[model samples]
Target: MARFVCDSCRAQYMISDDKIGPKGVKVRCKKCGHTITVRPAGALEHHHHHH
Candidate 1:
């Protein structure tokens, strides 16, 4: 599970891990209708080639 906060209204949202993709997911805030991108902590590391 991941928590996303809206930058516009400071609203908090709860997202499921399954909804998050490798590139992350875009969601809208119900309170302020702001767009929020949710990404996992280590999701970005998967794109890099560790040698």
Candidate 2:
């Protein structure tokens, strides 16, 4: 998953798929309804741990 944070709203969220695209994904904050640009896989924050 790709983690994302909204600078304006400071809201944190995650996208299920890793393939967000080279231009990155643009989305709105569900909390504050602010527009945010999600980072790509390389710039994403992964929190998954090994078994």
lDDT of 2 at 34: 58
Candidate 2 residues 1-51, lDDT tens each? 344667675656556446455545567678675564566445454457998
TM-scores for all candidates?
A: 0.40, 0.33
Clashes of each: 0, 0
Indicate which candidate wins on TM-score: 1
lDDT by residue for model 1 (1-51), tens = 234677576655556667775556566777676665566554232345587
Instruction: Evaluate residue 2 in candidate 1 and report its C-alpha lDDT on the 0 to 100 scale.
Output: 34
The positional error of residue 38 in candidate 2, measured at the CA in angstroms, is 1.8
TM-score, prediction 2: 0.33
Model 1 residue runs over 4 Å out of place are 1-3, 7-10, 42-51
